[PDB]
């Protein structure tokens, strides 16, 4: 329709479009504060965690890498950050 405001686009369209083709290019990823029942420490895990993680105090599994964002464990609590 030849008239768009390309300076303040709608956030629905920002979530629709690609993470590179966004007007301000930036990530769609995030970090998580993940708590395991076998440890008291807090661990910052990436959403696309990309590598199996052990804890600083104990040997346990809390993520499983895949093609996109990794699958968190069933018996493990998580919080966004």
Partner 1 sequence: TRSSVLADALNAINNAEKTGKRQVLIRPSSKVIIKFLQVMQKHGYIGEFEYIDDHRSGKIVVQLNGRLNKCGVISPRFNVKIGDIEKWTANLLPARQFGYVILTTSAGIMDHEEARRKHVSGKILGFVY
Partner 2 sequence: GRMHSAGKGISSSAIPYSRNAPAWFKLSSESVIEQIVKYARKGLTPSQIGVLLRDAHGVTQARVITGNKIMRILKSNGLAPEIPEDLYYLIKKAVSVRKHLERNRKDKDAKFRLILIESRIHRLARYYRTVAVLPPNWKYESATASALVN
Partner 3 sequence: MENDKGQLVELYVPRKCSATNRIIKADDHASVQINVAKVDEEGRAIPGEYVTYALSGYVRSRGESDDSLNRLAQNDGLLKNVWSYSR
Phi, psi of 11 (to 5 degrees): -70, -25
Q: Are 42 and 53 in contact (CB under 8 A)?
A: no
From RNA, partner 1, partner 2, none, interface partner of 45 (C-beta below 5 to 8 A by class): partner 2
Alpha helices in the chain (DSSP H): 11-16
Going by C-beta distance under 8 Å and a sequence separation of 6 or more, which residues neighbour residue 25? 19
The interface with partner 2 within residues 19-78 (CB under 8 A) comprises 19-20, 24-27, 31, 43-46, 49-51, 53-54
Q: CB of residue 20 vs partner 3: minimum separation in angstroms?
A: 21
Binding site for partner 2 (CB under 8 A): 19-20, 24-27, 31, 43-46, 49-51, 53-54, 81
């Amino acid at each position: 329709v030849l008239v768009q405001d390309l300076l303040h686009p709608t956030a629905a369209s920002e979530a629709r479009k690609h993470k590179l083709k966004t007007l301000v290019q930036g990530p769609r990823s995030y970090f998580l504060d993940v708590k395991c029942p076998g440890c008291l420490n807090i661990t910052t895990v990436f959403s696309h965690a990309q590598t199996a993680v052990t804890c600083e105090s104990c040997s346990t599994i809390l993520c499983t890498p895949t093609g996109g964002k990794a699958k968190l464990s069933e018996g493990t609590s998580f919080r966004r950050k």
